[PDB]
Every structure is written in C-alpha cells, then in structure tokens.
Ligand binder design. Sequence first.
Ligand code: SF4
Ligand code: SF4
Ligand code: SF4
Ligand code: SF4
Ligand code: SF4
Ligand code: F3S
Ligand code: F3S
Ligand code: F3S
Ligand code: F3S
Lengths: 207, 104, 509, 509, 208, 104
Amino acid sequence: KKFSEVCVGHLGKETDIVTLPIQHDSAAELAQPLDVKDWKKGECDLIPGKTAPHIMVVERDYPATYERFTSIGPLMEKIGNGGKGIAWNTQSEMDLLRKLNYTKAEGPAKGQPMLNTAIDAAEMILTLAPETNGQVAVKAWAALSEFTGRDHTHLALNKEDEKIRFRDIQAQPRKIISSPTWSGLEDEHVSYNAGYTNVHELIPWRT
Amino acid sequence: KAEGPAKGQPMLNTAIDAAEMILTLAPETNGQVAVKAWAALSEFTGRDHTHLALNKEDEKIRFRDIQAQPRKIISSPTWSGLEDEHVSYNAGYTNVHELIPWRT
Amino acid sequence: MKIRSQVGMVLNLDKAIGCHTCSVTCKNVWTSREGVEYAWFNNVETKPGQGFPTDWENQEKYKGGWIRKINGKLQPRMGNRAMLLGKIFANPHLPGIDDYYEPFDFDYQNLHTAPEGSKSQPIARPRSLITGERMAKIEKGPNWEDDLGGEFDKLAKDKNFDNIQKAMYSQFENTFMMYLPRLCEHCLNPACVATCPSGAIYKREEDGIVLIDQDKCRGWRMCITGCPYKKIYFNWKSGKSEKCIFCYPRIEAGQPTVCSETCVGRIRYLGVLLYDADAIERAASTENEKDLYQRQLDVFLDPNDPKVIEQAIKDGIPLSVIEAAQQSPVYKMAMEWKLALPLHPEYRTLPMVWYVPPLSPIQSAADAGELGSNGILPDVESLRIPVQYLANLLTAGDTKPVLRALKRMLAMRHYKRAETVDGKVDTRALEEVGLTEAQAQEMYRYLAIANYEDRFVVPSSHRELAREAFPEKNGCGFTFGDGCHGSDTKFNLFNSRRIDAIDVTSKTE
Amino acid sequence: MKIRSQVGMVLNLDKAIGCHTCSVTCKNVWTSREGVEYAWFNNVETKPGQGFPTDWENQEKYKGGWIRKINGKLQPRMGNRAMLLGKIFANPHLPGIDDYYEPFDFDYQNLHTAPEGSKSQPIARPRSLITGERMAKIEKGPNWEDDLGGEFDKLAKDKNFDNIQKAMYSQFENTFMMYLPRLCEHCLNPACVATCPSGAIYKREEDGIVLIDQDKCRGWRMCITGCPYKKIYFNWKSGKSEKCIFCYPRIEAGQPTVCSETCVGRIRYLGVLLYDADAIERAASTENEKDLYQRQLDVFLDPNDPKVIEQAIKDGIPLSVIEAAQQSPVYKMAMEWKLALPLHPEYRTLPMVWYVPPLSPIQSAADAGELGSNGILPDVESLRIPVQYLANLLTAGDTKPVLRALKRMLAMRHYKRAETVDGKVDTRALEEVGLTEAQAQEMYRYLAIANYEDRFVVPSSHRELAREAFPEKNGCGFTFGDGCHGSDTKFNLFNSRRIDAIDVTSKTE
Amino acid sequence: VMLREFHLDNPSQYFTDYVRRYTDMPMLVMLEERDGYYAAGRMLRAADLVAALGQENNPEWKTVAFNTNGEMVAPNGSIGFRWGEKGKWNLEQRDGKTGEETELQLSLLGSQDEIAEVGFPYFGGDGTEHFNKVELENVLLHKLPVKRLQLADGSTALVTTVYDLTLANYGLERGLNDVNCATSYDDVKAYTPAWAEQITGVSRSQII
Amino acid sequence: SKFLDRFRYAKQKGETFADGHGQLLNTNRDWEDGYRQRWQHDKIVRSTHGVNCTGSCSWKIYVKNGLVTWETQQTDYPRTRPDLPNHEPRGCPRGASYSWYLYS
Ligand code: SF4
Ligand code: SF4
Ligand code: SF4
Ligand code: SF4
Ligand code: SF4
Ligand code: F3S
Ligand code: F3S
Ligand code: F3S
Ligand code: F3S
C-alpha cells in the first residue's frame, strides 16, 4: 500500500524485459537433444527458449501494486491455470471465489474477487487446487489423459463434489484429493505411495 | 464374535458399534451404498439416477468424524430432494426433475 | 479530546423471536448461585408490559438516571452527593424482592420418597428460596407477562404508552406485541458509577465494560436505584451488588458475549465504537432530551478518518482495536444506516446497547388494501405497532428517527424483491429514504445473510499491555491461597509471596 | 478384603523414542511457577545414566523407600517415627538444588537493548533463577546425560550396572542406550505418605491418586527423602512440597493425563486396576525382594470374576469403574500377557506405573549371523541390551520375568511376519512362550494399532458421589474470596457463607 | 549381490518384468571410439536410424530398444511423445510407430555381433587421508556385448543396452571372462562386498 | 497489603476528563479474576438433545470441576451457499437448560 503511493511520479506503467530459463514440464524442455552448444562461442545461434533463456515482456502497473495484491487477477480467467505440464479452465472456480471473497467495487481490479484477509487468500488456494476441489481434480486428470491416451479421471470422479473450505478444516483436518500433480493416491484402500500412478496408471516419469 | 451362535459376525457391543452399523449401511451416509441404491431405483424407472450420488461415491461418514464436525448427508432414493451445493433440499424435487413417480 | 474504545451491541428487534435462550445461558453461567437466583443479567420482556423489575421504566417512582438542573448541570435523579448520603440508612426508592419476584423451587423429592399407601398421587409443591417455606401459590415470575399474559388494562400501564390514546389497542383486531431483550447498557455516563458512595463501580478504560468491584463494594445498595435500566441486582446473600459483566472474560480474547453467541434469532451484533470521553458530560447535559440521541452519535468517532486513527494511537488504542472499529457492524447500523437507536436516551446515561426497531403486520383496515409505494410489501404508515410507542422507548418521543429506520428496512425489502422476483433494478424506495444500492446491499449482507464473522467483530482487550503476561501465563489459576493478590504493595501480614510473580530480582539489570 | 480402584499406567519402553514431549507439556501446565521451575513432575532419562536428581536410584545414599526389619515389620529406610523426627531440624539425606540443577534463564533483552557502538555482537548470557546473578557457565541440567552425553565411566556409575561386568559396554561396537520416562508411581504403599510428619500426604480412596495437601503441608521436607523415586520436589519459594498429581482434574472426568495424551510415541496406556487394600502390607513385607513383583500381582483382582465384582460393588466401586477395569489395557499387559513390569519393586512401595522392557538391535558378533528360532528376526538371546541391566531396573535382579516379556514381544513379531509376509499360520514362537493366537492378536491390537480408545480406558472419578454436585455446578469458580472453603464447620470469624452452598434450609423437609 | 542372485543366477519373475517395463535398462546406448577401447556415449534416438523408425515428431527425443524378436523399436513413453502429439506418452509396452504390443529385450548377450571393451570411470582409489581407498585403475575396461548399426547419416556405430552397461559397472561376470569383474563376493573388484568392506568398514557378510 | 494500598490514595489518581466530570484511576483490578475463574472450564464435549423438537442442534457441553456445568451452541456446522444464511447457532431456551437435570 505504501509502495503504491510512494512510487507515484517515479514508476508508472512500465515494460519489463524478463529472462526465463528453459522450464522442465514445458515443450521447451526439448532444447538440446544430442550435445551442448554455447551461442556465445558461436557454436550455435542465440535462440531464446532453446539455446538461451526465454526473453519475456512483462507489463507492470506499479501504482496499482496494492490493488493487484489485494485481488485475484484476470489471467486465471483469460489464460487459465495449470502445472506439471498440464493446464485447465478454471472459470467456475473464479465465479465461486467472487461469491466467497466478495469483489472490488472500483479501481484497477474492479469486479475481481478480493484478497483482503489471509482467509480470502486461503480460500483462493483451496478453491483453485485440484487436491482441495474435486471439480478441479477431474479437469486436471482429464487434461493429463490427453497426453497419455488413458483415462485417469476415474481417480477423482468419486470425489468430484468435494470442496475443502478453511472453516471446515478449522473444525477437523481434511484428507486431500488424488491429483495429477503427484504420483500416489489418496485412497481408502491403498496408502499414498510415490510412483504408484506411474506403475499402475502407466503414466510416464518425466524423463 | 469369537464364538457362540453369532461366531464370525460383526459386533454390536457398544452404542458406537451400533452407530457405525447405521452409518455404514445407509445410502445417506455411505456413497457406495448410495450409488447401489440409485442403481436399484433406475431399474424401475428406466432412467439413470446414479448421477445423483456418483460425485460422492467415496464419501463415508464415521461416528468420530461427526464428533469433530457435523456432516451433510448424501442424496438418497429414500427421499425426494437433493443434498446439493447448488440447490437446497426440496421435497418432490426428484419426482419433478428426475421423473420418478410418486408412489400413488 | 480523549479517545477510548468499547465493544457496543446492537439488537435487531425486527428479527427478535422472544425465545429467552439468551437469558438461560447467562443464568447458567453467571447467576445460578443462592443470592442472585432471582437476578437475570439478561432478561427478555414482552411489550406492552411493565417488565422486570415491575415498572422499571417509571423513573418518577424508581428515581433512576440523571436530571439536568436549571443551571445546566447534571445530577443523579436520586439526589446530589449529600442528598444521596442522607438516604443511606434506608434507601427509600429501593426495589423490593417482590418487585422482581420471590424465587422458588419445587419439592421434586416428594415424588421419589412419597410413602406407600398415599391417599392421592404425590406432587411437587413450590417452596421459597428465600425462606425455605411452602408457598401456597406462585404469584409472580421474571417473565410473568410473556406474550401478553395479563389483562390489557394491566399491561398497558406500560410507561411507553404515555401520551398515546391506547384504547384502540385493547381491541382484538388491533392486538400487537413485541420483544425487548436487554442487559446492562455499559453506558458512557453511567448513573450507577455516579451513585455508588464507595466508588466500587467503574468503567474499564480499554473496553468500556462497567463493573462492580466485588472486593471494594460495601453493599450501600444505592447504585440499584441509580441505574434507570434497573440492571444492577443486589445479591441478598453476599450483601453486595452484581450486574451484567458483558462477559469480559470472553471479550478479553476476542470472543462474543454468551448472550450474543447463543442468540438463536441471530439479532445481536457486536462491534467497536470509538468515542471522545472528553465530550461525555457535554453530550449528556444537552438541554432538550430529544437531542440526546444525536448528541451521542456526535461523541462516536469515524474509525476510517486518519485524524481519528492518529489520535487513537496517541491515546493508546491498540491497532487491532482500531482495525475492528473500521469493520464494526454496530458503527454501520448506528452511524451509517441509522437503523439502530439507543434505549431510553432521555435517562442521559449515553447507553451503549442499541436497538433496531421492529416491523409488524399491517394494521386492521376496511378492505384488503391496495398496492402502496412498496407494492405488495408494507409502507411504513401501515404497520400496526404505533410508532409513537417505539419512539417513547428509543428516541425520547421523537418519531422521526424511528420512522427513518423502519422505512429504510422496508425500502431494502422492496429493492431486493424487485431484484430477486422481477429480476429488475428498482431503487425507487431506496431513493425515497436516501439509501444507495451499495448501502442496501451491505445492509442485506449484515442483516439477512448475517455470517458469524459479520455479526461479531470483537477485538482482543490485549491483557498483555501495561501488565506482565508472562509470569501470569505461568502461574495463574493455582488458587492455593497466597493471600498476596489484589494489592500493589508487597508487604503482607502472613509473610507470603505471589504465586504468579517473580520474587528473585535479576541482578544483571 | 477391601477393594479399591486406581487408574494405573503402563509405558511401553520398546516404543519409546525419548522425545521429552511428555515433560514439556507437564511443565507448561503444572510447574512453570518460580519455586518449581527446576521441578519436572515427568522427566525422561537416557540410560545408562544417573538421572534426575543425580543417582536417585542409590538408596544407600538417598535413604528412600522401605526396609523389611529382621522381625518382618516394615520401616521407612529413613528411619522409624522417632528416628525420622530426630532428623527434622536438618534432613541429613536431603537432595540439594545442585543434585537437580541450578535453574537458569538468559538475558535475551540484551539482544534488544544493546547500545549503539557496541564493540562486539551482543549476546544473551545465562543468569540464575535462584540468585538472579550472572552465571559464568551452565554446568548441569535436568537432562544433561541425554543420548549418552558424558564419558562412559561417568554414565556407568548407573546403579543398574550393579553386579554386571560393564567393561565390554565401553566399546563402540557394543554401545547401547534406552529411554526411561517417569513420573510419580502413585504407589499402593507409598513411602512418602509414611514419612510425612504432618500427615499432609494421602492416597485418594476413589482413584488411588497420591497428593500433597497444599493447605496441610507444613514444609517438613522429609517426604522428599522418603520417596525412593525422588518424585516429590520441594517448592523453594512456597516452602511446601509438590509432586505429580496424575492430572486428577482431567482423570476425574475420564480424560487421560496430559503426559499420556501428549505422548508422541504412543507408548503410554491407562487402565483401571482393582486391588485388595487389606493385602498391601502383607505383599510389601514379603521376605525376598524378588517376590515383590508377583506379590503385587496377587494384590490385583480379576475384574471379570463375579466374586470380585460383587465385592467391588459392596465396597463402593462405581459400576462404570468396574466396567473400565474389565477392558483395562494395563490389566492385560501386567496380568494377562505379563509384558509390563514394576519399576524397582524392591523399594517395597508397590508402584502403580509399570513398564514393558525394550527390545534392541542384535549384539556384535563374529559374522552376519544365522536364522534363529525367529527366522530373520531376533532371538531374545541376541539382543544387545544386557537383560541383567533391565532386571535390576524392573524385577529386583530376576531376569526370568524380563526374558519372558521380551521373548513374547519377539514371538508376536514372528507370528505376525509369517502371517503378513508368508501368508501362513506359524505359531511355533507363540507356543514356545505360552501364548495363544488370540492373545498374540490382542497384543498386536493394543501395542501395534493402538487406537486412542484402546490406549486410554479411564472412567470418571464420579465427583457427584457422597458430595453435592448441584450447588457446586452452580457456584464453583466464583473466586471472590468467601473464606469459607476448606472446612466442614460452618462458623467463620469473618461472618461469611460459602458461595457455592445453600444457606437457606428447606423447611418442608 | 541383488543383481547377481535375483537377476542373473535365479532370475526373479517379478523383478525382471519390472525393470523391463519401468526402467531405461532395455534402452540402447551409442559407444564412442577411444584409443584402444570404447566409452559409453549418448543414448540412441529414433532420429539416428534411416527411416527414423517412422517417427515424424521429435525423433531426436525418443529412445530406442530391441524387442524380443531382435527388431529395433521406439517404445511409447519417451519424452518425444509428450509434446507435439498426443496419446502415446504412456508406459504401455507398445511400438511407438505401429502401436502394436511389443516386448523389450534387456540384454544383448546371446545375440551380439561382437564383444567390445568399454571403459568405466573409477574414483574409489582417490580421496583424502581420512577415508579408506581401494586402488584399481582410474578407468576400468569391461567386456560388453554389442551390435553394429547403420545410422541415417550413412555412418556406422556400436550400441549396447543400459542393462548390460549396468551389470558391467557393478562388476558382474557374465561368461565373457572379464578380468575386472568379480569371481566371487570376496574378490576385491569394482563393486563387491569385499571391496565395500574396505571402503566402508562394514563387514562383507552383513552387506551380503 | 490492601490496607496499605489505601495510602496510595491520591497517588493512584490519573488525568481527569470531560472537564472534571470524570476521573481516570490507576488502581488494582486483580479482583476481576473472580468472574474469569468461573468461565474457565476443563473441556467442552459435543453433544445434542434426544428430545422430539426437530431442532437437532449441536452443543458444546462444558465440564468444570469434573462436572457438567452449562452449555452453549456449537457454531461450526458446514456453511450453506454464500447466498443463504448459515444455520449457526441454532438452539432454543429449552435446550439451553438441559444441564440442570444432571444433578437436580
Ligand atoms: S445500564 Fe449498566 S452502566 Fe448503565 S447505569 Fe445501569 S448498570 Fe450502570
Ligand atoms: S453480556 Fe454476558 S453477563 Fe451480560 S447479559 Fe450477556 S451473557 Fe450475561
Ligand atoms: S512414587 Fe509417588 S506415591 Fe510412590 S513414594 Fe514416591 S511420591 Fe510417593
Ligand atoms: S500425570 Fe499429569 S502431573 Fe503427573 S507427570 Fe503426567 S502430566 Fe505431569
Ligand atoms: S436446543 Fe432446543 S431445538 Fe435444539 S435440539 Fe435442544 S431442545 Fe431441540
Ligand atoms: S452503591 Fe456501591 S457499595 Fe456496592 S451495593 Fe452499589 S456498588
Ligand atoms: S430472546 Fe431469542 S432471538 Fe436472541 S435476543 Fe434472546 S436469544
Ligand atoms: S514431609 Fe510432609 S509437611 Fe510437606 S514437605 Fe513433605 S508433605
Ligand atoms: S519421551 Fe516421547 S515417546 Fe512418549 S513417554 Fe515421553 S512423549
């Protein structure tokens, strides 16, 4: 909040050039297949995202730092959410969050869910994550299924209506939902064991 | 039971044992039973009703868990309303929306 | 300008269901001892009625509250300092046990021990908890008038019917009744504190809770008369007086009072109010009693005003208390929406437990009626409870603020119906009462949905400030009897030392 | 024959992880006051070691427990009544503060207040909680020997190494260590009760918990010497002694003790034991100390025996207590499976907190070894902890009962492995130790799975019996200071009355 | 010891099938020419073969192995199938080109074109004075079964499986009479119980 | 000594306020522990009422001095949709008085 007012006249809507290394679990991980080439040594061309880091452009609205900090941004709805090589649509979760956290009445983030309290932030985490929201869990396993060609949604369908809430865990700790983010199952017949999904669901190790 | 007339059968010694019997057998408190119950009904109506409990098929309410926090029950064919997060429980709802006849 | 804070309370009488749950929980926790069995710190009364104790609102009879002398100075209605002391040998205005009720119990054991061959079925008869003697009949109780129990001519003696032609209300078709739950108002200008000769009653600086020091009270029993709400009850056994303690043990850690958290109707709200203590006397001594309500609002300070915030910090108000004040449901209802009103502001005590007046079924008419400004919903003019009665109860007879509160509640209803039934935006009713869509939606959030976190916004009383919480955490509760508690001087005749203190001083500075 | 009940405790040393969680929780709740900061009602010691206080097991030095005179009569090792009184002006055997450790704190504030321009980085140095003076160095603590902290020759002074050629254990390859958590044993024949001149120490009839009356204790400090487990700690500030109270406030309503419910290793079990109080002296005075263990088992009564049940009811034992006794994990481990053993039965106090001995890694050998009677799992003869050490600790030097306990634990393991790995029934090991499949499965249920409801089977102490719970429920806790608590006679000099009592007598009988 | 007793001498049905389907052991590694011997180079990729094993997408990111019929194949699951395509990034034992079921072969021993000596780095002889060391050779030459392959660029190359490379690395004698392989657990060789006893101080019998 | 404290009379006087209408005092308040120690309890247990009311309300049963002393409603029911009010605290005057029976 203080930064947002102190930066006025010094920093405004800026354009930032950010380097980003080639990421594991992204198509770019298939960078150099047979050997190592150093572009600075002229052994290859400087190709960002392959023989060098990605060169990204990031727009920053410094005066709006506080308003952005205290609200859930529009990228969740415009781009979506994901991780570990898979992505999914999370519109329904953002709609839920608008009702749970309320929304910005005005300003740069008008209409976006609020992030005023730590609880609002906790609810964001719980609602968006597949481990804590069966709806997301099924969409996540579905995304993975596209890659493997094998159905994995059966791993979360029986808990699709499950939604862990902050106040419920204050009443009693809750067991999470099987998620593609991991490799073991949260099941009532088999304990969580890493590599279990690779061995039993035939999902490859990311090697 | 270790021996006697009921040897091998589950025990009903304490009130908790009895409570667990209720919770485990009922479709309202055991998603596994809920799905089997809706499936049985589906035979009569010719319409699938298992979709009403599939999303909670792994749910199993336990006595000690409800001591920690009261738990909402599962939609069951024993009743005519839904235990849902988008629509409140309203009697006759399944007859009107699932086309299940009133027993008249 | 001296800023202080207090957790005020607002009771929404429109949602009141007169269930008394609040009274039972308080009783179980705080007053189940012999001596105060007849005392109900929290009690609910059905109106019209005379209440508990009987006719407590009749100050000409009970002499409670303050009066504003011709010279403009305030004086307890009981009398000035000398006048009051002259009444100490026998308080002439003191309410008697019969003004409350003679506490009773029943001989349940007779049901168990009745001898064989009894001529009739055994029964459990009433017995007095004061004398232990058989009572021929129970003739009174703390809630005797519940739900219009008693002839109208008796109930209508209700002080609030003053200046009202009440005959019409004795007719069946015009019947009306409402509920008034109440506790101590924990006033800014308490008459009790001012009328105690020993100075045993005080208002806590950090949270404004008013208490009767059980060590220092000498049992002069003058305070009982001083309180115009008759919320101080004499403990006939201990010989000392007791009163609602606003559940300070809970409030101190940020919890709601027992009567607030256990309110079944969900009508009680708890929120901080910051007030200028230096303006208390000026406000309470305003010439016209119909100005007391607004004068008190003027003593309440805007918690979002940086000027107030900085002053608050300078005056020692904790940051978490200021924060709580900024999201206080009580501040919104009393200051912003003007829905909450004080209880009998004319007593001049600047009460801190306020009320939102109740709506009621439309009055009897010639026909079924026509659509009014609010469509099928009621217009304020059609409500059956006479607004003048509510004004006598909450605004010193001025119907203006009561009508505003009621009209705004009805306006919110009109606006929400257009929204939820017609799926349209209709702000006609809101505009008529000076409310914006945003205000109506927030009112709805707090009054209708009323989530737990929105009903109670109680900050910690911060017991660590200006004290030594560490040794206390380690040794409080070991009640072996060190005989050193309650005094600042360390010397004690029994040559002992405090269990929860450190006697070996650090020699390394 | 006089039956009484008590909630005994069993600690499974085989599952002990020596974490001290039990010690910290007890400390936070019961002994964080100045005067007892150095006292650890529950303390954990690593063996081999001398413990807390140092060498507490050396009765020749500390004079704790009982001795059996030539005439067969019991006498406190401290001396008979006259001998003990002759030592009252200065207890010659009393442990000094240094036998425990000098309690310390640190000057943390120096880190906050160090002045600008300090020549070196500020630091928090130790200070004595006894004198408040700077301590040049901390040289002792209540858990100084944790995990073999100290030279072997020092740790090996351990009393339990008596009659053992301990040289071999000073070799790296033969290193061994175990954990011994302990509290007050709440004995059937407590030496503390017998050695207190004021008679301030007593065993509660209804639950056998032993307490030091904080009103009646006169600070004669003889009991401290009397207790052979050194579980009574002098409060140097109050001048009175205190000890583990077996968390009676919790036990009274059926809850586990704090150290039991907070035991991270899940090694503590709580269960009722019914005992014949009339046999206490006979058992404790048996001629051979190696017979004390069995003599005590003989004082424990079979809770499923109708003869005992009917006698129990006649002697006032509540039905819920008898029921709890019938599903007592402590009774199963001590009486049925013979896994639990008393701690130092030779002190002749008939301790009520027992222990299951620990298993250990196999000893050093010439090669990797061969399959034994238990296959790849250990045979009792191969365990590295010398059984004689464990016998000195739990069975007065008799290795027989220790070997039985250890062998049975290993047998259960063999049986379960055949079941879970080979999918076969192999009772060879069980038969060798006299266990049935049913017993092994129940042992497994309680020791391995160990559900909460199986670890703690604590009945209510029934505070309503022979008392008046109603007035107490209504008025307990209002600590205003009526000055009438603690005496049966109603007369009191301050002309007051009990807050939690009824003074107005019923006149209707 | 595990490999010797449960993989070679008395092959475990469970273990064998497991490493066959869940490890890169059956994967082919290209050997690099050195002075007098070979060194294990990079893993063979589908792109290295003429028809790229019918792999159009990410052929340079898909590993290769021989099926039990001596045929070379690009099994599903390799990182190349993760991007640019879908449905084949799984551990089903199938041919990444024909989509037909296949069985990967672990060792080339018994179907090799020749035996080649591959050098393995050994650091067990280095270290400070505070730790025991076992002197052998900085480079240990092992006899590995290989097969010569015709690459897409027209050149030729020798390949062996990760499986064979692993057994050699552990010092397991397989009948090729490898002087650097153990004749028994007591033989001080690069990786035996006898060897480890010297390095760690743990008794060989315990290790065994 | 409370008697000796009386001598710190004027010394415990702080600032006056409201133009002399009030006086701030700096005196002992230890007596307040009297009501604090009444509220304090051993534990709370979750229970409800087996009476035919339809309430089905979960309560916190307070145990103090090893006896049941009073009850207050639980407020931790799973919350209803954001557009609906929640159920807490439920309860009624009858239920609030149940504790009376135990030793009555
Ligand atoms: S309502 Fe409370 S604070 Fe106000 S005068 Fe009465 S007892 Fe005092
Ligand atoms: S605030 Fe507390 S003491 Fe006062 S009436 Fe309510 S429950 Fe009773
Ligand atoms: S262990 Fe406890 S009961 Fe036994 S003698 Fe010591 S203090 Fe007394
Ligand atoms: S029983 Fe209670 S008092 Fe005794 S050691 Fe355990 S926690 Fe401490
Ligand atoms: S509080 Fe009242 S309504 Fe609720 S369960 Fe108890 S008796 Fe029924
Ligand atoms: S007048 Fe004062 S002395 Fe006690 S009885 Fe009232 S608080
Ligand atoms: S009467 Fe009932 S509605 Fe609330 S204010 Fe008392 S609990
Ligand atoms: S001897 Fe007795 S007098 Fe107190 S110090 Fe020990 S309990
Ligand atoms: S040492 Fe740890 S294992 Fe239990 S007995 Fe104490 S909490």
